[PDB]
Amino acid sequence: KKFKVVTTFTIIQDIAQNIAGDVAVVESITKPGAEIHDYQPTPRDIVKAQSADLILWNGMNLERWFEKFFESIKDVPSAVVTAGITPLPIREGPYSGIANPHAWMSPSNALIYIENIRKALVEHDPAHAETYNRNAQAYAEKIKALDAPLRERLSRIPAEQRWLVTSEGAFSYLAKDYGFKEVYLWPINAEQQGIPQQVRHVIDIIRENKIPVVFSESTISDKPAKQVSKETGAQYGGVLYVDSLSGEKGPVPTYISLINMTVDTIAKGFGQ
Ligand SMILES: [Fe+3]
């Protein structure tokens, strides 16, 4: 039976599986579409994690459930995959000053995710070290090749008009890399107050700058974004993918597809 890796959520599953190739099985705890910040694990998840040889998670306070869940797991090592990530801080709300956990939305950060996951796989399954090393380098080259198409895809939005209005403030790392000012209805997924007041502050920012499009994301409700759309007259741009891939048969089966689809959907929103 092959070396088994279990990850907290789907983005890490797909990156690790590319590095693992056919010498290791990598599975996600959270299923596609499920909210990952305050996920409530199930009996299935304990059995799945307990059957793994290694458990990977994001850290940076992403999985608020993980440490309690990991208590119920005996004699399975865990490894965070975000060593060396430079955090962007959350700037408003009850989590101000905590790291924004969504670092994988920058493809240059994905190279660090790859290196950290390569290091963990090699450390815990050294028999397959050269497969992990070969796959990690090959996959890293795939990530590097995205920068040119992605920039070209957004090249038609003039710099002054690059406002990214979303529901969760989950795109800070992507926005910083591609010169977007970010606007959001809540800084991070959580049980929290202040969203109704922030909804009106976003409406003011949209009206002030005549921002033409707003978005929601695949693991949360589209209702706040559509309410903002109706009240401002801005177009509802659809669903961006940050916290989860789709199923393998859906439109966003891989991490590369997530970056491309999100950037494409954004550019579509500004299309004239
Ligand atoms: Fe999130």
Author numbering: 40 to 311
Q: Please, what does the article write about this entry?
A:
The substrate-binding protein YfeA (also known as YPO2439 or y1897) is a polyspecific metal-binding protein that is crucial for nutrient acquisition and virulence in Yersinia pestis, the causative microbe of plague. Yfe is an ATP-binding cassette transporter made up of the substrate-binding protein (SBP) YfeA, the ATP-binding protein YfeB and the membrane components YfeCDE. SBPs are classified into clusters according to their three-dimensional structures and the clusters correlate with the substrate specificity. YfeA is a cluster A-I SBP that binds metal atoms such that site 1 binds Zn, Fe and Mn atoms and a secondary substrate-binding site located on the surface (site 2) binds Zn and Mn atoms.
Here, structures in which metals are inter-coordinated by multiple YfeA molecules are reported at 1.85, 2.05 and 2.25 Å resolution. The crystal structures show how a metal can bounce around site 2 and trigger distinct assemblies of protein–protein interactions. The metal recruits site 2 residues, other surface residues and His10 tag residues from multiple protomers to collaborate in metal coordination and form crystal contacts in the lattice. Three histidine residues of the His10 tag are resolved in one protomer and no histidine residues are resolved in the other protomer in the asymmetric unit. The arrangement of ligands results in square bipyramidal coordination geometry, where the His314 ligand is at the apex of the pyramid and the other four ligands form the square base. Square pyramidal coordination geometry is commonly observed in protein–manganese and protein–zinc complexes. Varied configurations of YfeA crystallographic packing show how multiple polypeptide chains can collaborate with site 2 to coordinate the metal. These configurations include a non-site-2 residue from the surrounding negative electrostatic region (YfeA site 2 inter-coordinated structure 1) or multiple site 2 motifs (structures 2 and 3).
